[PDB]
């Protein structure tokens, strides 16, 4: 049991959803038709992968997922793509008219027409679970559907499932692939509204992923396909703890007890390694020590911040592949000594480590190399605020001249909600500062 | 699909309207008979936006043609692609307009507007998901300018939440001596400010100056001007007609381009104007005052927002870099209180004939030069009460003419007020 | 028969519980199927202290296995002696406790607790003369910690005049890395101070040191840690399971080991320290045994005895050996460290011998000390707790289950009282 | 003829009691099945031995004894021992749980539920007596039942047999074999309470018996069986005068008259000689003079103390075997000059002497060599007060911190009963001090 339902919202959520589910199928040996020849328990079972895949009588393994978008063209690609047979039609939900990059339209005007249906389809999945753990919500900050509809859905999930946990995979907007001047408004609006409905939220900064793909993968002009594929390896490492079984493995629930000290401080920073091209992987075997020492390089982080100019409140290292406890220990030592790791006074301990012996995997036709071992670090640092800050600034620069707000008010929104948000965000920036202040 | 309903009212509206359907039909591989005969599936992915797919695999433009004086309509029905249109969508009058805005808007135009509305309604009800409307017209004549805006106002009542888009040709003495134009333009601009969502200002002064100084065609004809218009219209609708992620529909464009409701008048630009040129050259030219389809120097104002659209096979890396250079090198001419306000689309299908082209859509405060020039003229006639007869004749009052005067003054004031504003 | 009811709760409780039942089953000549196969009648004389007898002359451990998650049980069930336990005595849930004392004690735990008490009650009505209960659990998690202490409290209510004894594994950041363990531990010590008669403090910090420093196990596993716990648990329960004159039941032990009600936390010790798999070429001389068991390096709690004073000590020697020499060496130790035993409890060191040795050893010795130095263990936990609690860090995990922060303040207070009370008697 | 009922309380009492009755049997020629060929009156008698054994019409001689222990293990041994047929089930009383080395649990908690049963069984034996003289009570100071229950019983026996003598045999706690740190508590509690109810108590210090076994018997680590066989030699010597024809100490009352001038100072010191290893290869048979001298060596006392630094109030010499009056009187005058034997002024300096011609019977297979003559000295000397001082000092050491006191208070005893029992012992030490303060 302990199932997890995935909800992919808007283009980013959906496109990222495709990449993850493809990766999951590769990892568990599931084919595009849903058959998994290595699974004897036909029709049903209690295996680890069943937390993400349900089983039909015919032996099909169906993702515990829902795809939702306010227009059809992105999800149509799933309906016709290699994995179309993988999903039951009721899992792919589409409307006719999108939010037009307007939080207001996704939350109110358009969202209101399709929200009931989405919740019903989610109810049908939940009802198939013997022990529903929680939800995983993938969505962009900047789109009207990613922002406006997500927040509506999270409010409605809080009502229908109470305190059942909700984790968020959020695409933080970056100029290099942004599609709307208003993405800051949508980002602050969506973050405020979901802040109290979300238990833990993993931001991915598109500028950070863009830069890593150029530098580490030598991609001159990364596409969404480049980004979504690296973004997936992070999700797979946060989820592997639940999709695979092992002796040194740790469930995300234990990590969360350590990665969320206070209710609102629920935004961990993610780092993956090794991100290398086959051209450079050839003639190079990144050691457990090198990969770990990389998770502390301020340029291999999926959110642009300087972890050093701040204090750590938790560093959780989830390893995968040819890793053995002895090597992990030596590494953490070398790092602590020859590196800048300052923890807070209120955090006895500080490091949590785990190993998933299931090897790392790479999609045929990818730009990442098949390594024998990899590491994902989830760290709660007071430096993630450099992101809330930068975004908050863009917002304050436009709201002062009240730019583009006529589009939001024309759909019902009021200036108040725009200020109610800036204040929760100023509070969070203070909260992150106070959590680092030493004690008396 | 996401349908747009095209309406062209008047000679200019129908002339550039007709040229528009030729260019984009060609780009999508539709012949005069409605049959598709093209080489790429990209030409059909979004063809429902402007075309209805009837039975017989024939594509018919979703276009309504309107005029208060036939013949122009007749020439259009005879011109290339004339038989591609639906015969029921021809809606024309008899009394004509006589270059009189009041006749197009309050009298002759009104007695025919109901006939037009039935065609619009029929076309709209057929739409799976109506985007909104797209009108082509001049502001100097009577039908296009007068009935055109009346038609918009009537549409807006039935489709209050749809996008209203207009290609509007501004009058230039370099190209027309009807003398009364500045009256019809000013009364037209007064209406566009309140009732349209986004308006492309196609300034005849710029087309003449490009044909004369740049293209070197002394004494140029309407056919010459409309080659620039058709080029331009094709450019600014590229992202609406092909698969893409940026400004793929009229509302997303409006959200990126219109920061304040009234400041919705766009400066179009095109490069190259017609040896082949590179991506750096393409970028430099499209931001140069001499490639603007509106008589305005962008160095005389600041950009609120800009969309750039590159068409053809080229290095996306090269495009991104060159775009950053031009924003940085020209940082002073962009308002700092709208971060990341220049968006860039790249459609890999070039237009017919060129290997790559750039299209510029600017929301610049320098467009007040276009309105100031019209305003100057308007006052240079209304100050003598000249020709107030044609308009009062049809029962219009004294005020109206004055309200349009101060209303457009305000518009110029707002563009200025946001040009001078600072981030701190 | 003076029966004991054994309860094991949670992951640690069941893992060290199961190994305990495997170790003493072997010592008593019972096999995986519950059949007696021994060479001595000395093994069957008190067999009923821990085992029930059915038809088939089979022996069934008087043991209840409790957990809030379905694993662990499966593990125990498939273990070598998985089949000896009574099936009706497996009581488990599906939610789990998420290493959260509040879930074990107040919410998830409460749903399962009543069905546990029926099996406890079932086992107790079967006993001719019930001594009381013993529970194995850790204090750092949620089930053994939170639900474990709930079970003690509820069981005490039904049997207020029986001995309650626990084997309580103290958390150490050397062995685990879950940040809330000091919260669960402090909450649990407060309970144990109020509701148990005797608690053996089994400290994972000392188990780590023994394995890593003394036995040179550079990749220690819980299997290694539990090898020492089971050796220690067989040793400290020897007086209950074999004929003998001293500490032969839980109440007589409490009267000898607990001079003041709250001071009922024992330091176990064992000698020789051995790592499983290895073989003993030379046994140790009674002298060597005696010197070692009093040595700080052989204590199962990570506290230096030289930093405090012994109130009471029990020593249990097992194996064939000179009763005369044991006396001589025990006197030497007392005469040699006579400043470390309080002067106002005369003859406070008591010595037992049992002829049956434990598996693999020719000679062993088990130390049970009530030393004031146990305060260092509770001080260590207390320091970790305050580092977090003074900022209310991670508290939402507990308040979200209905706990108030006042209840944390009390647990810290009670534990600081306990520490200072040990300090009171050290300066006597 | 007057009978004596024996009462054995707790493990010490039962195991020592079990030792004595076997030795009584070997001395009187009573077989394990109760048949006594020497007995020629079948089914009845008023012989000296009938004071301890009654008779049945089937010729069975059964001890006039009652065993009581709150746990069954020890009494089970009696029920299955080699002398199981001697006793019948009604005289063997056991409980379920014991006093857990807790005087309060033996006296109040577990005592109250069994006191009336024990008294009933004792009444049943009592009704079969034509002239019951009283009781001999065997118990430890340190156990919960031996200390706590005994005091209750002693009290009830004074109520239901107000007109009877009560003798005690008391095991005094020694570290070498003790099993609870709290034994000094139990010792002072039971002494305080039984003191007013006991006419004469023989204290046997396990420490003394432990070292005599080591030194004289070559027993490396004496067990209870070793200790108890020696103790039975002493107990038997003291009661010999009740079970055989004679004229000294012939009834319980005569013990108090001869040994106890003061009621509270009723603790005579016992000394026994000679103790010879049975594993020894023949030994210089000691003379009357030599064994009489041995009575004034500390190493043969049942309580280590130094009678030189105290005063006598009474002395009884009991000889068994080849002894005639001339040699005793000639040994006495010798000792009286060689040794410092100082009686209290208000007391005649003199010895009461008793000779039993039957020599000591030794249990076959025991540790004690058979001898031709032995002697037990009973001396009421103030030197025995040393044992109260030792005991009381340990009590004071623990009580000052209230260590372990909560175990007693939890069983319904009050804290005041501690300082009260201690006060009585404070008074008892001063009584010894007054009576023996010349120097
Ligand atoms: C007996 C139970 C145990 O096996 C004991 C340790 C922890 N786990 C088993 C697995 C294990 C261990 N280390 C792992 C690293 C990655 C993945 C798995 C492991 C374990 C080991 O090295 O194998 C023998 C181990 C773990 C630690 C460990 C030692 C250790 O080996 C014995 N340390 C005691 C702590 C540690 O934090 C510390 O305080 O330094 C001593 C330590 O720091 C370093 C750099 O050594 C370290 C090592 C990863 C760092 C961060 C997290 N903390 C928690 C405990 C600590 C660890 C062994 C449970
Ligand atoms: N990393 C990543 N970002 C994406 C992807 N698709 C969109 N985005 C980002 O998402 C933001 C815009 O949101 P979208 O997902 O495009 O839009 P939407 O959520 O569907 O909302 P509407 O368009 O209003 O219906 C921009 O910052 C994009 O860069 C993707 O596949 N990967
Ligand atoms: N000489 C001798 N001393 C004994 C014997 N048994 C116990 N003792 C001593 O008596 C004290 C303990 O008294 P026990 O007889 O064990 O106590 P009990 O009467 O059984 O009391 P509880 O069992 O505690 O209720 C200790 O000092 C023992 O050393 C025995 O057989 N012989
Ligand atoms: N670029 C362009 N401008 C035109 C064309 N026809 C007319 N105009 C302009 O439009 C104005 C006259 O509008 P007109 O078509 O006569 O309006 P109508 O009476 O409503 O049909 C003049 O200022 C002309 O400059 C044309 O074909 N191309
Ligand atoms: N010595 C030992 N400690 C253990 C074992 N299993 C868990 N622990 C410790 O117990 C604590 C975790 O408690 P856990 O058993 O998971 O608690 P639960 O959630 O109530 O079942 C940590 O401090 C671990 O180090 C074991 O088999 N042996
Ligand atoms: Ca299966
Ligand atoms: Ca007779
Ligand atoms: Mg979308
Ligand atoms: Mg006993």
CA distance A392 to chain B (A): 12
d(CA D257, CA B209): 153
d(CA D75, CA D95): 10
CA distance A331 to chain B (A): 39
d(CA B282, CA B272): 7
Enter the tokens of residue C247.
């500490």
Enter the tokens of residue C339.
């400043």
D400 phi, psi to nearest 5 deg: -60, -30
C402 neighbors C106 (Cβ within 8 angstroms):
yes
Q: What residues does each domain of chain D span?
A: 1-268, 269-383, 384-437
Breaks (C-N over 2.5 A) in chain A follow: none
Tell me the chain C residues in contact with residue A314 when contact means C-beta distances shorter than 8 Å. Answer: 179
Which one of the ligands is nearest to D146 CA?
Answer: 3
Binding residue per annotation — A226? no
The candidate with the shortest Cα–Cα distance to C296, out of C399, C388, C371, C382, is: C371
Inter-CA distances, D197 with A204, A437, D212, Å:
91, 76, 31
Q: Are residues B203 and B278 in the same domain?
A: no
Give all strands (DSSP E) within C259-320, no chain letters: 265-271, 310-318
Residue finishing a domain among C227, C259, C291: C259
d(CA D345, CA D238): 27
Residue finishing a domain among B347, B366, B385: B366
d(CA C152, CA C105): 11
**Is C55 strand, coil or helix?**
coil
The candidate with the shortest Cα–Cα distance to B401, out of B149, B188, B258, B245, is: B188
Q: Are residues B69 and B203 in the same domain?
A: yes
CATH number, domain A269-383: 3.30.1330.20
With a CB cutoff of 8 Å and minimum separation 6, the contacts of B214 are: B273, B290
Which one of the ligands is nearest to A37 CA?
Answer: 6
Q: Are residues B349 and B402 in the same domain?
A: no
- How determined? X-ray
Question: Between vectors from CA B134 to CA B131 and to CA B140, what angle results, nearest 5°?
Answer: 160
Inter-CA distances, C11 with C66, C166, D229, Å:
9, 15, 54
Q: Are strands B163-170 and B198-203 parallel, antiparallel or unpaired?
A: parallel
> What's the CATH number where B149 sits?
3.40.50.1440
d(CA A234, CA A255): 15
**Is B352 strand, coil or helix?**
coil
Nearest protein Cα to ligand 1, atom 49: A329
d(CA A205, CA A302): 6
Inter-CA distances, C417 with C414, C420, C424, D342, D404, Å:
5, 5, 10, 58, 20
Q: Are residues C124 and C181 in the same domain?
A: yes
Q: Are residues B13 and B150 in the same domain?
A: yes
Identity of the residue in B249, B258, B339 whose CB atom sits nearest the CB atom of A397: B339
Handedness of CA A110, A116, A120, A122 (dihedral sign): positive
Which of the other chains make 3 or more beta carbon contacts under 8 angstroms with chain A? B, C
Q: Are residues B386 and B308 in the same domain?
A: no
C232 neighbors C368 (Cβ within 8 angstroms):
no
Handedness of CA A307, A311, A314, A319 (dihedral sign): positive
CA distance A410 to chain B (A): 10
The candidate with the shortest Cα–Cα distance to C273, out of C227, C314, C236, is: C227
Tell me the chain B residues in contact with residue A401 when contact means C-beta distances shorter than 8 Å. Answer: 259, 337, 418, 421
Q: Are residues C188 and C68 in the same domain?
A: yes
- Nearest ligand 2 atom to alpha carbon A139: 19
B378 phi, psi to nearest 5 deg: -50, -45
Helices D10-28 and D72-80 meet at what angle, rounded to 10?
Answer: 20
Q: Is residue B273 within 8 angstroms of chain A, CB to CB? A: no
Binding site membership of B for GTP: which residues? 11, 69, 138, 142-144, 204, 226
Which of the other chains make 3 or more beta carbon contacts under 8 angstroms with chain C? A, D
Give the distance (Å) from ligand 3 centre to CA of residue B123.
112
Q: Are residues B351 and B393 in the same domain?
A: no
- Taking only Cα atoms into account, the Rg of chain C, rounded to an integer number of angstroms, comes to 21
Helices B181-195 and B148-158 meet at what angle, rounded to 10?
Answer: 10
d(CA C193, CA C153): 11
> What's the CATH number where B393 sits?
1.10.287.600
Enter the tokens of residue B50.
């402007």
Q: In a mutational test of the pocket of ligand 3, which residue from D7, D9, D12 has the highest number of ligand atoms less than 8 Å from its CB?
A: D12
The candidate with the shortest Cα–Cα distance to A384, out of A246, A255, A232, A203, is: A203
CB contact under 8 A, B343 and A400: no
- The question of whether A254 is a catalytic residue gets the answer yes
Identity of the residue in C94, C99, C182 whose CB atom sits nearest the CB atom of A348: C182
Catalytic residue among D168, D254, D386, D411: D254
* Pocket residues: Cβ below 6 A from ligand 1: A 248, 325-326, 328-329, 332-333, 351, 353, 355; C 174-175, 177, 212, 219-222, 225
d(CA C69, CA C93): 5
Nearest protein Cα to ligand 2, atom 2: A12
C203 neighbors C265 (Cβ within 8 angstroms):
no
Give the distance (Å) from ligand 1 centre to CA of residue A329.
6
d(CA D259, CA D378): 8
CATH number, domain D384-437: 1.10.287.600
Binding residue per annotation — C10? no
Q: Are residues C314 and C218 in the same domain?
A: no
C 7-36 → D contacts, CB under 8 A: none
Number of domain units in chain B? 3
> What is the maximal distance between C-alpha atoms in chain D?
63
Q: Are residues C22 and C73 in the same domain?
A: yes
> What's the CATH number where C342 sits?
3.30.1330.20
Handedness of CA D207, D211, D216, D220 (dihedral sign): positive
Please give the resolution of this entry in Å, rounded to 1 decimal: 3.2
Quickly count: other Cβ atoms within 10 Å of residue B316's Cβ: 15
Length of chain D: 439
Residue finishing a domain among B212, B232, B259: B259
Inter-CA distances, A9 with A17, A71, A203, Å:
9, 11, 15
Give the distance (Å) from ligand 2 centre to CA of residue A140.
5
Give all strands (DSSP E) within B10-123, no chain letters: 51-54, 58-61, 63-67, 90-92
D346, β-bridge pairs = none
Binding residue per annotation — A11? yes
Q: Is residue C400 within 8 angstroms of chain A, CB to CB? A: yes
B337 neighbors A403 (Cβ within 8 angstroms):
yes
Q: Are residues C52 and C145 in the same domain?
A: yes
C166, β-bridge pairs = C135, C199
> What is A1-268's CATH superfamily?
Tubulin/FtsZ, GTPase domain (3.40.50.1440)
Residue D302 is classified by DSSP as: S
Give the distance (Å) from ligand 1 centre to CA of residue A353.
8
Inter-CA distances, A39 with A50, A354, A360, D14, Å:
11, 26, 21, 72
Handedness of CA C277, C283, C286, C289 (dihedral sign): negative
C236 neighbors C366 (Cβ within 8 angstroms):
yes
d(CA C207, CA C173): 12
The candidate with the shortest Cα–Cα distance to B404, out of B133, B206, B146, B104, is: B146
Q: Torsion angle, CA of B82/B87/B91/B93, rounded to 10 degrees? A: 80
Q: Are residues C358 and C428 in the same domain?
A: no
CA distance B301 to chain A (A): 18
Q: Is residue C273 within 8 angstroms of chain D, CB to CB? A: no
- Nearest ligand 2 atom to alpha carbon A13: 15
Q: Is residue C400 within 8 angstroms of chain D, CB to CB? A: no
d(CA C314, CA C266): 10
d(CA C420, CA A287): 50
* Ligand 2 touching residue A187 (CB < 6 A): no
Give the distance (Å) from ligand 3 centre to CA of residue D37.
36
Residue A372 is classified by DSSP as: S
d(CA B233, CA B168): 11
A135, β-bridge pairs = A5, A166
C and A touch with 3+ CB pairs <8 Å, answer yes
Catalytic residue among A90, A113, A196, A254: A254
d(CA C291, CA A88): 72
Q: Which range marks the domain in which residue C402 is found?
A: 374-428
With a CB cutoff of 8 Å and minimum separation 6, the contacts of C79 are: C18, C22
A264 neighbors A167 (Cβ within 8 angstroms):
no
Which one of the ligands is nearest to B136 CA?
Answer: 4
Instruction: Give the 3-state secondary structure of C9-28.
Output: EHHHHHHHHHHHHHHHHHHC
């Amino acid at each position: 049991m302990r199932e997890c339902i995935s909800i992919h919202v808007g283009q980013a959520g959906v496109q990222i959803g495709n990449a993850c589910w493809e990766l999951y199928c590769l990892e568990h040996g599931i084919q595009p038709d849903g058959q998994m020849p290595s699974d004897k328990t036909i029709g049903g079972g209690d295996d680890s992968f069943n937390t993400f895949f349900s089983e039909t009588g015919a032996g099909k393994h169906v993702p515990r997922a829902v795809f939702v978008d306010l227009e059809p063209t992105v999800i149509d690609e799933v309906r016709t793509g290699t994995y179309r047979q993988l999903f039951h039609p009721e899992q792919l939900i589409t409307g006719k008219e999108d939010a037009a990059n307007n939080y207001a339209r996704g939350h109110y005007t358009i969202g209101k027409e399709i929200i009931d249906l989405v919740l019903d389809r989610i109810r049908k999945l939940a009802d198939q679970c013997t022990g529903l753990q929680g939800f995983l919500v993938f969505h962009s900050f900047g789109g009207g559907t990613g922002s406006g509809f997500t927040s509506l859905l999270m409010e409605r999930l809080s009502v229908d499932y109470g305190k059942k946990s909700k984790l968020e995979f959020s695409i933080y907007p970056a100029p290099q692939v942004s599609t709307a001047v208003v993405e800051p408004y949508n980002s602050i609006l969506t973050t405020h509204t979901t802040l109290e409905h979300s238990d833990c939220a993993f931001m991915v900064d598109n500028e950070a992923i863009y830069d890593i793909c150029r530098r580490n993968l030598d991609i001159e002009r990364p596409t969404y396909t480049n980004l979504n594929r690296l973004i997936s390896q992070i999700v797979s490492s946060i989820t592997a703890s639940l999709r695979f079984d092992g002796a040194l493995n740790v469930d995300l629930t234990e990590f969360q007890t350590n990665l969320v000290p206070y209710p609102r401080i629920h935004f961990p920073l993610a780092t993956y390694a090794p991100v290398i091209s086959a051209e450079k992987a050839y003639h190079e075997q990144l050691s457990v020590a090198e990969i770990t020492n990389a998770c502390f390089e301020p340029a291999n982080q999926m959110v642009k911040c300087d972890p050093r100019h701040g204090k750590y409140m938790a560093c959780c290292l989830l390893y995968r592949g040819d890793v053995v406890p002895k090597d992990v220990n030596a590494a953490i030592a070398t790092i602590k000594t020859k590196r800048s790791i300052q923890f807070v006074d209120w955090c006895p301990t500080g490091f949590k480590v785990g190993i998933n012996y299931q090897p790392p995997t790479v999609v045929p036709g990818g730009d990442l190399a098949k390594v024998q071992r990899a590491v994902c670090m989830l760290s709660n640092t007071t430096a993630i605020a450099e992101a809330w800050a930068r975004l908050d600034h863009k917002f304050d620069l436009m709201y002062a001249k009240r730019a583009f707000v006529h589009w939001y008010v024309g759909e019902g929104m009021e200036e108040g909600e725009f200020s109610e948000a800036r204040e929760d965000m100023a509070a969070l920036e203070k909260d992150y500062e106070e959590v680092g202040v030493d004690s008396v | 699909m996401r349908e747009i309903v095209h309406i062209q009212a008047g000679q200019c509206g129908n002339q550039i309207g007709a040229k528009f359907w030729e260019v984009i039909s060609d780009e999508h591989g539709i012949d005069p008979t409605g049959s598709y005969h093209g080489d790429s599936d990209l030409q059909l992915e979004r063809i429902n936006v402007y075309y209805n797919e009837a039975t017989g695999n024939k594509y018919v433009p979703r276009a309504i043609l309107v005029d208060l004086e036939p013949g122009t309509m007749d020439s259009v029905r005879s011109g290339p692609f004339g038989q591609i249109f639906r015969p029921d969508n021809f809606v024309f009058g008899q009394s004509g307009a006589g270059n009189n805005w009041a006749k197009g808007h309050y009298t002759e135009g009104a007695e025919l507007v109901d006939s037009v509305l039935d065609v619009v309604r029929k076309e709209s009800e057929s739409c799976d998901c109506l985007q909104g409307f797209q009108l082509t017209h001049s502001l100097g004549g009577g039908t296009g300018s007068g009935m055109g805006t009346l038609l918009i106002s009537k549409i807006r009542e039935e489709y209050p939440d749809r996008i209203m888009n207009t290609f509007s040709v501004m009058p230039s003495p370099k190209v027309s001596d009807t003398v009364v134009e500045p009256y019809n333009a000013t009364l037209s601009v007064h209406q566009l400010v309140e009732n349209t969502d986004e308006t492309y200002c196609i300034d005849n002064e710029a087309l003449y100056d490009i044909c004369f100084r740049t293209l070197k065609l002394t004494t140029p004809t309407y056919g010459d001007l409309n080659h620039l218009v058709s080029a331009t219209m094709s450019g600014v609708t590229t992202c609406l007609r092909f698969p893409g992620q940026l400004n793929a529909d009229l509302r997303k464009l409006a959200v990126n381009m219109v920061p304040f409701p009234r400041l919705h008048f766009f400066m179009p630009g095109f490069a190259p104007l017609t040896r082949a040129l590179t991506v750096p050259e393409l970028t430099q030219q499209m931001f140069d005052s001499k490639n603007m389809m509106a008589a305005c120097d962008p160095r005389h104002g600041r950009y609120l927002t800009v969309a750039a659209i590159f068409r053809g096979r080229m290095s996306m890396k090269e495009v991104d870099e060159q775009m950053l250079n031009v924003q940085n090198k020209n940082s002073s001419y962009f308002v700092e209180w709208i971060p990341n306000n220049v968006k860039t689309a790249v459609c890999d299908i070039p237009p017919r004939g060129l290997k790559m082209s750039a299209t510029f859509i600017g929301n610049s405060t320098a467009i007040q030069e276009l309105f100031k020039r019209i305003s100057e003229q308007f006052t240079a006639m209304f100050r003598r009460k000249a020709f107030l007869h044609w308009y009062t004749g049809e029962g219009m009052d004294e005020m109206e003419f004055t309200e349009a005067e101060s209303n457009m003054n305000d518009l110029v004031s707002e563009y200025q007020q946001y040009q001078d504003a600072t981030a701190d």
